[PDB]
């Protein structure tokens, strides 16, 4: 008489890439290796506005110009992972015997898993930080239609 | 919808206690599905990921 | 998994769950009657029609 282990299953996590969601359709992604040095970013617009000449005596506004400045806004993302001290140690040591080998790849699997969790949870941050930037700048519809 | 038909299997999937599972059943009284699979993943390709 | 949060707040550590399901056993029974006379006839070999 026995008892049977029918199955063992592990949830598999699919990678999520920002550049492959349709949220990025509203964004233009440029990479900047050393953004950590930039103090401030800036974009400056210059616009010149035409007029209509009229027969009427009323004074006509002269040539007009408009200059608008925009600035960069920085965002920061942080994540924390914890690892056993027993686990990091056996990474260094070579496996002496078969049980010490199986216990070894069990350590490299765990350390690797933690790293995947760290880098993955960084992609969720891009998707959220972008999505939050919009909802911060999205005025409601009932205000917008009249104003358009 | 003029379908009224579905393709299915015509026979059950079988489970049998073989020599590896059988030895464990006698000695320890514990049986694990696909001892073949557990051994393939533990003793044969440990390096390989899932 | 988790999301890295721009808001300043303590991060959550990596976590895992382990959940166990177990079988249910079902029992089914039926009864069949075989006539005593019928069994005796089956046992022998027939000669007369």
Swiss-Prot record, chain C:
This is Major capsid protein. The chain holds residues 100 to 148 of 1381 of the full protein. It is found in: Virion; Host nucleus. Homomultimer. Makes the hexons and eleven out of twelve pentons. Interacts with triplex proteins 1/TRX1 and 2/TRX2; adjacent capsomers are linked together in groups of three by triplexes, heterotrimeric complexes composed of one molecule of TRX1 and two molecules of TRX2. Interacts with scaffold protein; this interaction allows efficient MCP transport to the host nucleus. Interacts with capsid vertex component 2/CVC2. Interacts with the small capsomere-interacting protein/SCP. Self-assembles to form an icosahedral capsid with a T=16 symmetry, about 200 nm in diameter, and consisting of 150 hexons and 12 pentons (total of 162 capsomers). Hexons form the edges and faces of the capsid and are each composed of six MCP molecules. In contrast, one penton is found at each of the 12 vertices. Eleven of the pentons are MCP pentamers, while the last vertex is occupied by the portal complex. It comes from Epstein-Barr virus (strain B95-8). Belongs to the herpesviridae major capsid protein family.
């Amino acid at each position: 008489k026995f008892e049977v282990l029918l199955g063992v299953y592990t949830n598999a996590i699919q990678y999520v890439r920002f550049l492959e969601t349709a949220l990025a359709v509203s964004c233009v992604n440029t990479e900047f290796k050393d953004l950590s040095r930039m103090t401030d970013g800036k974009i400056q617009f210059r616009i010149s506005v035409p007029t209509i000449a009229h027969g009427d005596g009323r004074r006509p506004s002269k040539q007009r110009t408009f200059i608008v400045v925009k600035n960069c806004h920085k965002h920061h993302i942080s994540t924390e992972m914890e690892l056993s001290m027993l686990d990091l140690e056996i990474l260094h040591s070579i496996p002496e015997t078969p049980v010490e080998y199986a216990e070894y790849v069990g350590a490299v699997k765990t350390v690797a898993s933690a790293l995947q969790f760290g880098v993955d949870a960084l992609e969720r941050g891009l998707i959220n930080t972008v999505l939050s930037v919009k909802l911060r700048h999205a005025p409601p519809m009932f205000i917008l239609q009249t104003l358009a | 919808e003029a379908d009224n038909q579905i393709m299915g299997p015509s026979s059950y999937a079988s489970f049998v206690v073989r020599g590896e599972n059988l030895v464990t059943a006698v000695s320890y009284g514990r049986v694990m599905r696909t001892f073949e699979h557990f051994m393939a993943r533990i003793v044969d390709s440990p390096e390989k990921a899932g």
